[PDB]
Amino acid sequence: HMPITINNFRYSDPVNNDTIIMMEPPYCKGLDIYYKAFKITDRIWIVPERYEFGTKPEDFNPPSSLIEGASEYYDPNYLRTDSDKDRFLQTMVKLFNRIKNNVAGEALLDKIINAIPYLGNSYSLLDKFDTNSNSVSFNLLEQDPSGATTKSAMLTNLIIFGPGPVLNKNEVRGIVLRVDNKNYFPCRDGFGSIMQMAFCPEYVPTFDNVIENITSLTIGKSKYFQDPALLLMAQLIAVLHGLYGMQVSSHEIIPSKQEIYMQHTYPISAEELFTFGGQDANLISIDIKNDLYEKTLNDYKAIANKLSQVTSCNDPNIDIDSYKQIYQQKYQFDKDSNGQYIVNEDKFQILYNSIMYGFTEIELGKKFNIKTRLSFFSMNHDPVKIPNLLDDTIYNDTEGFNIESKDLKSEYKGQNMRVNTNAFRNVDGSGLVSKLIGLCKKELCIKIKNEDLTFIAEKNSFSEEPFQDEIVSYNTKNKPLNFNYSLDKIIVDYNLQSKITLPNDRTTPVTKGIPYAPEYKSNAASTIEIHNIDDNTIYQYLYAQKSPTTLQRITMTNSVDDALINSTKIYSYFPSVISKVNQGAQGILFLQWVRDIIDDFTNESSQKTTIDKISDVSTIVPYIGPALNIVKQGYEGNFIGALETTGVVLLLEYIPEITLPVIAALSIAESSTQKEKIIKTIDNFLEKRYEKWIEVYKLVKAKWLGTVNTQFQKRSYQMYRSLEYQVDAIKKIIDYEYKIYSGPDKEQIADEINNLKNKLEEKANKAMININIFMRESSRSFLVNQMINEAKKQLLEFDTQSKNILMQYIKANSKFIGITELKKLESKINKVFSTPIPFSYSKNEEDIDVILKKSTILNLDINNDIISDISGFNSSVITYPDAQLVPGINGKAIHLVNNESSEVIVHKAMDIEYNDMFNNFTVSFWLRVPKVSASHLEQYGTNEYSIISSMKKHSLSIGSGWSVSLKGNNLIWTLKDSAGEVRQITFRDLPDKFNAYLANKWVFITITNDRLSSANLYINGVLMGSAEITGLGAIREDNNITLKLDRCNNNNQYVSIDKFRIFCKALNPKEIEKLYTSYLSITFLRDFWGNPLRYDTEYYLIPVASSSKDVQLKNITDYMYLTNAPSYTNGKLNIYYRRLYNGLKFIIKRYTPNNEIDSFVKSGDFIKLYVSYNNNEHIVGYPKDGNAFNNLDRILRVGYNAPGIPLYKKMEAVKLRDLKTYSVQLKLYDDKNASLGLVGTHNGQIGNDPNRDILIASNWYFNHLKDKILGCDWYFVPTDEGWTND
Ligand SMILES: [Cl-]
Ligand code: NA
Ligand code: NA
Ligand code: NA
């Protein structure tokens, strides 16, 4: 890949007419106003001027107040001098270097460079490329050494200016055109335009980690400043959307103004939420995302027609067909037969999603190791200045602030304001303006920042479209139910794309049109909002907790008013803490007093409870009530009682309407009498019905995010501020009392007093963990119970009505369908409508282990005899009555028999999608199938039956998806696209059933899928099968993943499945190897089948190094030896194997009874080994001075019974080698605990006996534990129903 060039320059560098020009900006078109401009890279210009278009000079002065939004820094003198301009320029170069220095950043820039605006728009002649517009070109003025000045023009993508009036609020806008006295944006209907950014690198926003999950290193909270490179990248994402003509301007989230506690902001564009990414993207309901997608599809279709029937350009020196090739590439159009450009919907979906959803602030932060806010509604604090971005000791172009050599990389410490105090300065107070609200009590007025208020979305933010009638026919198109795109996929795509060399930018001067700059929308206010309240609010309660700045003895009071009035009194709600801190001189009991404070704080702050009536909330912190003045009438002393009788809704200031209007039943308008069209219409209908459940669930979730979750988030913040106040006050009291303390031990105790203050903070941090859990669980619980309950109510009724409509249509068309088809329809439809769609509460590069963990989107585990998804995505798992449990790899596994009740169904969570849009994916699981008898191979060898399937369940057919199937001794992987085309791996198992993978042994399956190459089947980490899958279309699989024997004609067939798991990428051999090994442990020893090894269980012994041999006994008291096992061969069926269950049976017993009551044999357990013979157990050991080949290989004896002769029989069952084999080693000790060696064999001849491999113990093996093949490795084989000798 060709590196992206970033140009270098000083502001004072002479114009060169290449990288440094005199530009006439778009909104100065034809006015002859020029500014020095600098080409940072292809298609991107920097103009180090304040963005003044549409403003007046007073706009640049700090106002007294703001109308709305977060705090704003004004500075009219910013970016005025040449040295300022140079500093700006040098900073922007550095930021562009930072961005390109990471492949994710490189991908973003590459995408922006090549997304050239279309040479025309909706109001062009539609047959001719038009460069004569300020939407696509800017004029420049070029001076010759001779003295001639020519005015020409350049096409560009992006012009970046310095900031407007507000430094700390960056903006991106497209060029507007005035047509028919109306504002038209080509960047909004497919074409794109020049995009203009106003940007400031040095005045950055701040945020905190208050509501974030805990880490394993830190539990305390901090404020962070943002990295300007990420701020820039966030703006570039908006630019990208504009270039693709996909700027949103329709469905905004409008803040309610109903109440005084509600946050004032400009409406939030849907596009801002998409740019930010993560869970907040779901604030836009799926029906709206669909409306936006449909709009852009239409826009792109219209652009395909325009580009096809283009004839010429206003500029004759442009190459129309060369521009026609960038555009084909840009819009991912295909060519017709006639050479017309057409939309391929598959390609559109990939392109659209990648642009709207692909790059996000959250994703980019992770790639760059830059800390971002976790929530779009997370707390913003005052902005700060970064004065020294150009100093590599503070900020460099590979690591930003988070520099590894300063130990600032770990946990974004370089952005942490507690730590990196060198990197930032507080802004000048005279430049900082806020939206303040005064609260006056009837003459104390407190000032609340707009930031401290709660965002509540107004009802008109939310769609009602899912409630409206929906018409189903055969022509009915399936809508996408997921609109997302991984940055991971973009990067992969990028690395697989070749360079695109743009044509010349230069064009003819812009002469047409008027340079209408939209008027600045001033946030200046000359008033502050002021309210009188009767009763104390949350804000009085918080403010009452604030300590004075001036050093004095502080006391605590349980009275808010008392604290509001007195500057030395702090409101508290920890009565024991209060009692203790209010105490006077302790004299010599001072240290114990400080200890006592810490103890009381610990007990009081750690209070937690549960209420049965709120059964899915694990942690209730009772003191929230008195801390924030959350009180219910009649329960003034009883918050827990209040919560018990109200539910979590008690915690909400704004109580939303949660009941929902009726959902119109689906309707059918289909006249066709063709059977194929009727069935299609039914299939369409069933899908549409599913889509309704999803749409409504998503709408409710959107409303919850914008009206409910915001409040619970605020409660978290409020409680954090309260606890912070409490800790601060206590610290000040301890500090004050320590100061005036006189005692002989003052100096000596200084450390402990400091440790105790630290412990205070720790306990407060732990309380905050509880509070965060409380609010998260209360929020989820309100969504999942109260809100989604109402949805279900209406959806159940929708289902009933919709079922009637469908049954009507089938009855009316019954003569065209047929009685056999009609019976299937009936039972199918009854099944479908007798099961609701569940609601999922999804969660949504260190090393390989991390990569395996992060790319897992489903993971079935069994706990407490229950199968569930442990991935975090929270897919619902339904276990049917005859799904059975057996021993697994780690705990228990799933056992499926050939009946209808033997079934496990996974309903994938709402937001997971691992194999659409041609996404790469891997599926893995442990599998155990019985050795198929010769008889069943004859009867059923050609009967292909699935065991796992995602394949879409239509009314009368099975559609797109994947399946695992078996057919005799073949394991089959099938991919099916939405056209019915398939790709398959057929793995033919080994004929030697002792070594075979489908013969009663736990084996690890891994199937990777690379949509641009092939599907690969691995067993035990080894590649076994491959199929090219290139050319296969889109996979649109069922929501359900079904584990079940499907179409199996053998009533006795069964399978076991463990650790079923899906990854959202194609794993590479190293990853699979690591995945495979990660399941293998030495702790529990294994039998031959892969099950845990057990005491008091009969096992046949087989040596690994000689697996065709059985162990035999010469006689009681005597030695053991190897002989060939009887064998089975079947040429017809191409199967053979050494027969099992012949030869000596052994039993393992604990050497001495211990405090374990399970019967699992663990590695390192002391054992006695016995032979079961003549319905007796005979101990295996070595007699003292017994025969031993060359005095080293001790010959083992069975039931040796010679009086006065010590018999050594203490063994250790151990896993010392070969983790991938289900084999065991046995170590024998003498009575002085000296090793007599590992149990193996030695070739020899005793007396008249034939030459034999004789069982021994020998220390020789201990020098060979890394060898590939060792005679000390033993299989333990118990009789098993899965293996019967033929
Ligand atoms: Cl002997
Ligand atoms: Na600057
Ligand atoms: Na995303
Ligand atoms: Na006070």
From Swiss-Prot:
Cellular component terms per the entry's GO annotation:
clathrin-coated endocytic vesicle membrane; cytosol; endocytic vesicle membrane; extracellular region; plasma membrane
Q: Which InterPro entries match?
A: Bot/tetX_LC (IPR000395), Clostridium_toxin_transloc (IPR036248), ConA-like_dom_sf (IPR013320), Kunitz_inhibitor_STI-like_sf (IPR011065), Toxin_rcpt-bd_C (IPR013104), Toxin_rcpt-bd_N (IPR012928), Toxin_trans (IPR012500)
Q: Which UniProt keywords apply?
A: Disulfide bond, Hydrolase, Metal-binding, Metalloprotease, Neurotoxin, Plasmid, Protease, Toxin, Virulence, Zinc
Active site location: Q235
On cofactor binding, the record's note says: Binds 1 zinc ion per subunit.
Q: Which species expresses this protein natively? A: Clostridium tetani (strain Massachusetts / E88)
Family from the record:
Belongs to the peptidase M27 family.
Please give the name of this protein.
Tetanus toxin
The coenzyme or cofactor needed here is: Zn(2+)
Report the SS bond pairs.
C440-C445, C1048-C1064
Output the GO biological process annotations, alphabetical, semicolon-separated: proteolysis; symbiont-mediated perturbation of host neurotransmitter secretion; symbiont-mediated suppression of host exocytosis
User: Looking at the keywords, is DNA damage present?
Assistant: no
